[PDB]
Design a binder for these strands. Structure first.
Lengths: 148, 76, 31, 187, 437, 76
RNA sequence: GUUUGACCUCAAAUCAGGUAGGAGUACCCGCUGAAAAGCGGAGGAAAAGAAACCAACCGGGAUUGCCUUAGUAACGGCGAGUGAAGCGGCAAAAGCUCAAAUUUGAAAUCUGGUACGGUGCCCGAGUUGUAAUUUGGAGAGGGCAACUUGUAAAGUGCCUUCGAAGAGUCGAGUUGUUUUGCAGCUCUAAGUGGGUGGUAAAUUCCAUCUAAAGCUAA
């Protein structure tokens, strides 16, 4: 599958091609708001290994944050904005000297596709509501420093 | 028990990384390091590489990789 | 500055594929 | 509007700044007639729609219905193939006697490797222009890739000659200008 | 005497019966009671006289006597130079051990490292291996049960010395335990370094028993199989034997030709030895048949006076081929014409032929008279899964046999164009094989 | 309660001491002639990250599994 | 062809269906924080949770809580005094799911509407990948052998070939904070790699896991 090639092309970020894509996409997002929706993940490999599935009930938001942690705060922004959505996880996509750009994956527990497909029904439970608020996300656990 | 991650580098992997580094090009510090090699020798090349990096083993790795680039480019 | 990119490794052509996956049964029998 | 302004501002800065030579391999694409005959070739190898699939399925299920049913063996289907990871999968075998790569993909990094991959593998790849038209010939909105492996004898000569043609028009013409930095002129 | 009177386990008796051997060869008769006595020994025997069975029976007797579990130890080690002989020995031993309770495996240069690594992790009670890969196994594999060494064998020491692996067995035997190990070895001839290795190996004092024009067809690498097919069609109704390298190639070509409906007999190691004897019997009695067999499987038995010797695949020991053709010429009063296929990279072999000083004849190939079946071969391979897999296995074993070849100056895998070999087997594109290139 | 391995203790203060463990191994349950997955449905604990390194502990827990198999009657 | 149509993107809905707030807050989880207060978020519990673990043994084996370890180790104008953890006994015990190679001999996936949770038909979503199978304890492909539970699904013995994994991350410099960790700025790797920890009769050895993703009752 092609997603490997995405992974190892992403591995070389400061290379000419990906720095060019960084520098065009940073500007293009700069024209856009602080928070807004993306039609598709710009790093689909990262989204999958963080748990993305391309079907109804998976929402992509691009969040802009000024330079707690920046990733956690960015997650909290969409947490307040999209209360109905539940924050799954986020990842880094782009940055600027003025702002850092992150892509967050949110899941709707109301769409029957998520409510069915018992692989993901677990997020429908009320106990998972606002994981980012309680630091239960990946960055939340990392900042809390919970490991063995 | 030794994890299969431990075993070795598959042919697909060396192929993939060679193809990536080809299509990526050379970074401005790398574009520097090639000229610094060609001009003032591997000693100063290693010094500058280690200053750019943190440790020395990564420095020798980088210098050896870039000598591979220089050799496989100029002669072929 | 800028310089053109060298094609020193693309010019070598491999005569074989990367992976020797054994062909599965289902590709030859009706599904 | 904001987004009309953005999209009109998009494609200006990209040409304003120097695109990497791995890009601008795109938009140095197949000429008019050659794309036209490529699509005429493909339109014989449209994949079966979900609707046609279901019609043949109910037909054959009804054929099994009879007492006095009928049992037969049928040959392989023939169609283009279009899914991205599947397209790369038919590469590294190799099986793609042809691959078409759309130029306009918003995550271009999904496709930047495909030209070099098929170059080194020797698959006769071509950069088609417009993912939507690939979608039209494949019962999809968009495809971004179109690989073909198996071809009937009635088109095999056409396939081979088109392969030589694309080798003449794309690999020969644009390899030296695939080989330079594009863009960089202000707008 | 016979094999069956000697004290043997019932499963070994059944295996011997189903492989059909009742009598023994005289030298094997001399060596067997020594093998039961447990003394070390060196021996001179002709290649393929049944000496493989001669050690397989008493080693399995030892495993009857000890009854140790697969995890407890590995026991018997077998060292054989070439991949072909190792595979033939494995195929001979597979049934003998299938009636018996212990475990078998292969350790060969060119096979997947991970398969054999996992097998060594599980443990193998009868190891059969080539000299080169055993060092890697003993130095790299962890937890491999090695301390036992109930016994060990070397086969045809002259050939390993010719290959140049003497350092490797010195290193191994330094790694090997000795007090539990008992060494038997077989080598038709001997040299001083072979005797040195024997002195290091044989723990007690051993008692030993000691008892022309050629065609060359320079055919380019792809049309050689099809040229064989055409030449075979033209010389139908003449009994002909073809020498290959890999048993897989023999098998695949056999049913390939059977599908094209020309009668063929197959004689390769993987077959059961009774089907082997039967096939040789119908070949000898019919007097008009195509036979496809490996170099060493042919070596192990005498050849009836034949219309054509062809060697399709490269030889294993070219010196033995020169002597074999000499003996065939002086033995078969009926003229047996011998020819070898070649590849344009192989012309060095011809100068080696000039070193043999025997005369040589060029047999020309007309580009007009071509079967033109390659498209049909491609369509068949695309159609049938079974022929697909068998062609792939034969091709894979062909390249692995090239990897195991000794004389590199005459055969370099780099010289060979692999797309074109793949076309020879009927693949447009080479299937990948893990081979060091 | 689920049946458990009798296991050897670590350290030197209790090097002489024997304990109740978590699970046997895959290798040991295979030596029992049954599978770990099916052995779960019977109420036998299984631990995969553990390794068997002592012969006597292994043999004792094997005989323990034999007597467990003997005393159990399973309903279809 | 100045036409028409494929997409992409964006708007607008008194279009259809849902969802967020607020109160309380004894317990729980994050942020902030003085000489606790405050903020944010639930639930009946919550959190954590199946080793990039602990150890050096004759090794142990998710997490959680109690006794002990123990007022010991360690820390501290080594002053005030601060203050653990392995292991062991006990309670209760639970293991699982992704992401990496193709189904390509047929997206096999699913929301919604409609006629009778299900079934049909139709819109759609989706190949920039929904299904099945595989999470390293391996697993996959076939073939042979038997078994055991509509050319149905699953388990085991043997031969051969294959056998794919978390990067602005690891790490390094510096600044602030904290008692080693955390946060910011410059830099940024490798794959028989990497991390951690012992070890010399030292051009050393072997020891132990696999991060940069996720769920899980008691």
């Amino acid at each position: 599958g092609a997603y490997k090639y995405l992974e190892e092309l992403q591995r070389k970020k400061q290379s000419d091609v990906l720095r060019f894509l960084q520098r065009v996409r940073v500007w293009e997002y700069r024209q856009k708001n602080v928070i807004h929706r993306a039609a598709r993940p710009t790093r689909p490999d990262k989204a999958r290994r963080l748990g993305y599935k391309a079907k109804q009930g998976f929402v992509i938001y691009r969040v802009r944050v000024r330079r707690r942690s920046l990733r956690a705060t960015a997650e909290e922004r969409v947490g307040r904005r999209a209360a109905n959505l539940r924050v799954l996880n986020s990842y880094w996509v782009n940055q600027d000297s003025t702002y850092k750009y992150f892509e967050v994956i949110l899941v709707d527990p109301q769409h029957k596709a998520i409510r069915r497909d018992a692989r993901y029904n677990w997020i429908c439970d009320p106990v998972h509501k606002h994981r980012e608020a309680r630091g239960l996300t990946a960055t939340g656990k990392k900042s809390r420093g919970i490991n063995k | 028990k030794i994890s299969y991650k431990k075993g070795a580098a598959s042919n697909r992997t060396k192929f993939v990384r060679s193809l990536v580094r080809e299509i990526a090009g050379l970074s401005p510090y790398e574009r520097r390091l090639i000229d610094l090699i060609r001009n003032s020798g591997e000693k100063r090349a290693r010094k500058v590489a280690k200053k750019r990096l943190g440790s020395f083993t990564r420095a020798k790795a980088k210098v050896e990789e870039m000598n591979n680039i220089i050799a496989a480019s100029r002669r072929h | 500055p800028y310089e053109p990119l060298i094609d020193w490794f693309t010019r070598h052509e491999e005569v074989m594929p990367l992976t020797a996956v054994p062909e599965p049964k289902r590709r030859f029998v009706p599904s | 509007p904001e987004y009309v302004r953005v999209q009109r501002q998009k494609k200006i800065l990209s040409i304003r700044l120097k695109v990497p030579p791995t890009i601008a391999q795109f938009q140095y694409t197949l000429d008019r007639n050659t794309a036209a005959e490529t699509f005429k070739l493909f339109n014989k190898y449209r994949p079966e729609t979900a609707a046609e699939k279901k019609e043949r399925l109910t037909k054959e299920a009804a054929a099994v219905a009879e007492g006095k049913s009928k049992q037969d063996a049928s040959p392989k289907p023939y169609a283009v193939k279009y899914g991205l990871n599947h397209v790369v999968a038919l590469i590294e075998n190799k099986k793609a006697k042809l691959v078409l790569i759309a130029n306009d993909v918003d995550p271009i990094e999904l496709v930047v490797f495909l030209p070099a991959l098929c170059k080194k593998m020797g698959v006769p790849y071509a950069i088609v222009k417009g993912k939507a038209r690939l979608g039209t010939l494949v019962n999809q909105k968009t495809s971004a890739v179109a690989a073909l492996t198996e071809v009937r004898a009635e088109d095999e000569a056409a396939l081979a000659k088109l392969v030589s043609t694309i080798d003449a028009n794309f690999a020969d013409k644009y390899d030296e200008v695939k080989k330079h930095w594009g863009g960089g002129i202000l707008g | 005497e016979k094999f069956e009177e000697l004290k043997l386990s019932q499963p070994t008796l059944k295996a011997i019966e189903k492989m059909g051997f009742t009598t023994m060869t005289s030298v094997q008769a001399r060596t067997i009671p020594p093998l039961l006595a447990g003394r070390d020994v060196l021996g001179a025997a002709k290649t393929g006289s049944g000496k493989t069975l001669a050690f397989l029976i008493p080693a399995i007797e030892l495993l009857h006597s000890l009854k140790f579990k697969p995890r407890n130890g590995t026991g018997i080690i077998v060292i054989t130079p070439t991949r072909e002989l190792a595979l033939q020995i494995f195929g001979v031993a597979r049934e003998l051990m299938e009636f018996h309770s212990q475990t078998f495996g292969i350790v060969i240069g060119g096979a997947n490292r991970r398969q054999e690594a996992e097998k060594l992790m599980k443990g193998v009670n009868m190891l059969i291996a080539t000299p080169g890969r055993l060092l890697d196994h003993l130095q790299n594999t962890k937890g491999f049960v090695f301390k036992n060494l109930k016994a060990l064998i070397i086969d045809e020491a002259d050939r390993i010395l010719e290959i140049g692996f003497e350092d490797e067995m010195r290193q191994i035997i330094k790694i090997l335990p000795n007090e539990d190990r008992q060494s038997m070895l077989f080598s038709a001839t001997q040299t001083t370094k072979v005797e040195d290795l024997a002195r290091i190996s044989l723990r007690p004092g051993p008692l030993f028993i000691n008892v022309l024009e050629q065609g060359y067809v320079v055919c380019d690498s792809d049309k050689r199989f099809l040229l064989l097919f055409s030449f075979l069609k033209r010389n139908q109704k003449k009994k002909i034997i073809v020498f290959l390298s890999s048993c897989n190639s023999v098998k695949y070509y056999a049913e390939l030709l059977n599908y094209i409906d020309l009668p063929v007999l197959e004689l390769h190691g993987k077959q059961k030895q009774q089907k082997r004897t039967n096939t040789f019997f119908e070949f000898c009695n019919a007097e008009r048949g195509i036979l496809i067999c490996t170099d060493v499987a042919a070596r192990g038995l005498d050849i009836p006076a034949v219309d054509w010797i062809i060697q399709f695949d490269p030889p294993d020991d070219p010196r033995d081929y020169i002597h074999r053709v000499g003996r065939t010429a002086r033995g078969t009063k009926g003229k047996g014409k011998s020819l070898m296929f070649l590849t344009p990279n192989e012309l060095g072999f011809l100068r080696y032929l000039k070193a043999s000083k025997v005369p040589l004849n060029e047999y020309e190939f007309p580009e007009n008279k071509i079967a033109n079946v390659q498209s049909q071969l491609e369509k068949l391979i695309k159609s049938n899964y079974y022929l697909h897999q068998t062609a792939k296995d034969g091709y894979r074993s062909y390249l692995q046999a090239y990897a195991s070849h000794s004389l590199k100056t005459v055969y370099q895998i780099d010289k060979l164009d692999l797309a074109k070999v793949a076309k020879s087997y009927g693949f447009p594109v080479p299937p990948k094989v893990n081979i060091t290139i | 309660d689920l049946l458990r391995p009798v296991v050897r203790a670590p350290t030197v203060k209790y090097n002489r001491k024997v304990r109740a463990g978590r699970g046997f191994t895959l290798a040991e349950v295979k030596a029992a002639g049954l599978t770990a997955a099916y052995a779960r449905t019977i109420g036998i604990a299984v631990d995969h990250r553990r390794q068997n390194r002592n012969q006597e502990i292994f043999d004792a827990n094997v005989q323990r599994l034999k007597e467990y198999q003997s005393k159990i009657i399973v309903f279809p």
